Amino acid sequence: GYQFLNRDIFKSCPRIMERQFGECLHNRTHLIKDLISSGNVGLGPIEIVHMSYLNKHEKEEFGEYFYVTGIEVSGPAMPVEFLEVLKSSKRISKNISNNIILTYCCFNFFSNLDIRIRYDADDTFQTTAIDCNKETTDLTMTEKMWEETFASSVIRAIITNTNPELKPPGLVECPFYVGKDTISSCKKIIELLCRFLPRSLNCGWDSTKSMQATIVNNYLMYSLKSFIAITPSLVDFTIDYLKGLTKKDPIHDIYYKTAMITILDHIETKELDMITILNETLDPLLSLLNDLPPRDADSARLMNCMSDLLNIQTNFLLNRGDYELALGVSNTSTELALDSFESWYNLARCHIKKEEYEKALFAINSMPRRFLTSNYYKKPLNGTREHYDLTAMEFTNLSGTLRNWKEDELKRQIFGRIAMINEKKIGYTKEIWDDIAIKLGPICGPQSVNLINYVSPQEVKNIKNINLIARNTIGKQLGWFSGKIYGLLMEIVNKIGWNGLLNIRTEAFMMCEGWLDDLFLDLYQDLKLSKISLSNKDEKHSGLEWELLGLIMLRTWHWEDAVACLRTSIVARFDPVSCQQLLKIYLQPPKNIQEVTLLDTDTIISLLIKKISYDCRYYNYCQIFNLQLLEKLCNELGTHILRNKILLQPSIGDEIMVMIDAMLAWIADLDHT
């Protein structure tokens, strides 16, 4: 079942041709050294599998590789199984030697060791721990460092999967959460992340959402929240496990309690439990306070945490309409962390809800301010240009290691220097795999926020409203920081209009700046764009135009118009960007609507199947987001009716049902505990 699926995934990995042999491993080692000597390694590099081949005519060694996440490195067993499948299922020509070296690389960011498992043609393997700063150093592997490689791989797999901008094209994402016993496999992952909570500040953080890593804001906490979000039946288990950890390790109580609060956040059933734990966590902590003239570097570490817990409280109170109580908490939070964006953000929200717009604008003013990868991939740009950067010898070698592929079929699936082959076709539908996904290609990295850089240049040029593009390019992109501030401004114009917002700005001046002025003008242009009615006396507009207009309407909270525009962008061709926005709306609706259903389940299920198919084409077999959405659909439909609607889809077949029924079975297993 799951083993069948895993082996099929292992046999369907792409191939990147190394230009010069071993560049892949040398670049990795050099990247790691730069990360270490820059102070912030973060999660380090994604795992790679390297394959070393010998051409025999020519006496040339050459290499192939690909990026992968989701292999659990508990110890060497699972990577070795992966490598064993790769070698036993090889199909090579006579000119390629049977002596192949396979290497799996997993970086451990707890010890800054790159762990490498080498697999030879005599079926022997050896594991090596490389320190890149101490250069010549190779180490002996203890069970303690095996466990932090394990935690490294799991954290990195979750974070990478839930952030498409971090994904390289051709990334293989394995379903790390499946196993022989689903519940047991999920428990093991959760317990792993929980035990490493005292070290969560060493797991790196996203600097675009917070200035410094905090107990709340770090990748370990994020990854734990993201995984629990698809295992809601294990929340009670996790809370119990965390309570056990406090008993045995009370010196790190603040981490365990912060995880408890994080897990329970945004779960309506457990609001009383969250508030209660928040209470017993916050009003000691208030007391490491006062006794302290020494000012120590842990005091800033705890003021940050206390501030972040107050923000959780503030957000809770705002969402229940308790504006007076929220302001009392938010004022306290801003004092403990004047460096915190989130503290000023919530303060501004308190003032807006209390219709104190001047004070909100002051709070906004008094507020604080890519892994060189991807040479190897060339975009198809909707079939307008050729995407082939291989030499004849490089192609001969590639074909020689993929003997079962007929060579013109192989060449059609090469995008630059990577062969985007997917042999077992798990998740296949004809509509997606043999058409739209061949155009466009993988939608990932910083350009994946829209399709401007993926379609034909002509389609971009055929858009006459330049502002539609100018307000949707990739540098201009709002950013998470100013996207939040944009939201505050939009929340204000919603009440008093844009001209009213300007009047408050001078009110604030009466008791001036530039970057906020940029947002004001951007906001204005977006509002003008948002009231474009885009038809009859019957023109025609490309899908890209409908998409871009939809994105702007989302930005200005025109939900009905946005959903309508995004849907029509899919009528022409399937649009992964529009699709993802629609799925997101269904998963987490806007709060300001009158409990309206913008998208019925039949529409959503239609989109979800196409999206799952698209993600599978380029090796995303993890799909945490789509699992979340399937779970929500299961909740309100039941699993029987849901599966009926999936079977109704015109593009449905065995290949896509293998993926979907695997997902459904995993979800069904979780509803037992």
């Binding site: 079942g1 065995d654 290949e655 293998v658 029924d661 695997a662 459904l664 079975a665 069904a668």
Partner: peptide
Amino acid sequence: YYLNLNQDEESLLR
């Protein structure tokens, strides 16, 4: 269901 999963895979082979 895991039975549905096995049925799909048994059919993938044809």
